Each structure stands twice: as structure tokens, then as C-alpha cells.
Structure 1
Amino acid sequence: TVPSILNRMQTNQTPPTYNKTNKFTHGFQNIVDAYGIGTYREINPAPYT
């Protein structure tokens, strides 16, 4: 009966990078990932590549 809780917090660790890839763009996203994944929220070269 008594519920659980989900908590936010001030964080010092660096966020990962995520892209919501789709069927068509997966190969290109991998192509740009091959040389290092972009830092949090920097411009992705995948849509232009």
C-alpha cells in the first residue's frame, strides 16, 4: 500500500550521450561513433554525414 519514490539530485558525474536512433540512421550514427561519441549535447555530425 505504501508507495515508492523516484528522486532527482544534484549530480557531478558527466551525462552520457543518447540519440534516439532510427532504422535508417543507425549505420550513420555508428559511423560517427566509430571515432568517439560526442560530448553531452554537442552537434551530432550524423545527420549531416
Structure 2
Amino acid sequence: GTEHSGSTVPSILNRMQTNQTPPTYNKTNKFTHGFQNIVDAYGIGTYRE
């Protein structure tokens, strides 16, 4: 992004953690996505389950 418009904008991203509940993801592929879809028909479990 900085290269596209040279402006030397560092776009600093600091890191933190608080009471926020984070999203949930686990990688799937063509050989397993439909099965994860069957699992997700019933909702999704808690973070880090």
C-alpha cells in the first residue's frame, strides 16, 4: 500500500488484548469444507474449543 502511493506512512499496528471475545476460524480445504459445513449447521463453539 505504501508502494502504491509513496508517502512513507508507517501504518503502525500495535497489539493488545482485553475482555474482547475474538472471532473463531479453523482452516478448511476442498476435501474437508463440506464436513465443516455440516458441523457449522448447528452453530459454532467457543473460542479455542
TM over 0.5: same fold?
Answer: yes
Specify which of 12, 22, 25 is matched with residue 19 of structure 2.
12
Please, what is the CA RMSD of the aligned residues? 1.3
Q: If you compute each CA radius of gyration, which structure gives the higher value, 1 or 2?
A: 2
For residues 8 and 14 of structure 1, the distance between their equivalents in structure 2, rounded to whole angstroms, comes to 15
Per-residue CA deviations over 1:20-45 (Å, capped at 9, x if unaligned) read 11111100001001101121111xxx
Q: TM-score, normalising length from structure 2?
A: 0.70
Q: Distance in 1 between matches of 2:47 and 2:9?
A: 37
Q: How many residue pairs align between the two structures? A: 42
CA drift at 1:10 = 2.2
Whether 1:34 aligns to 2:41 is: yes
Distance 1:11 1:28 in 2: 33
Identity among equivalent positions (%) equals 100
TM-score (norm 1): 0.70
Secondary structure in 2 aligned to 1:20? coil
Structure 2: tracts of 5 or more residues without a match: 1-7
Q: CA deviation at 1:2?
A: 4.8
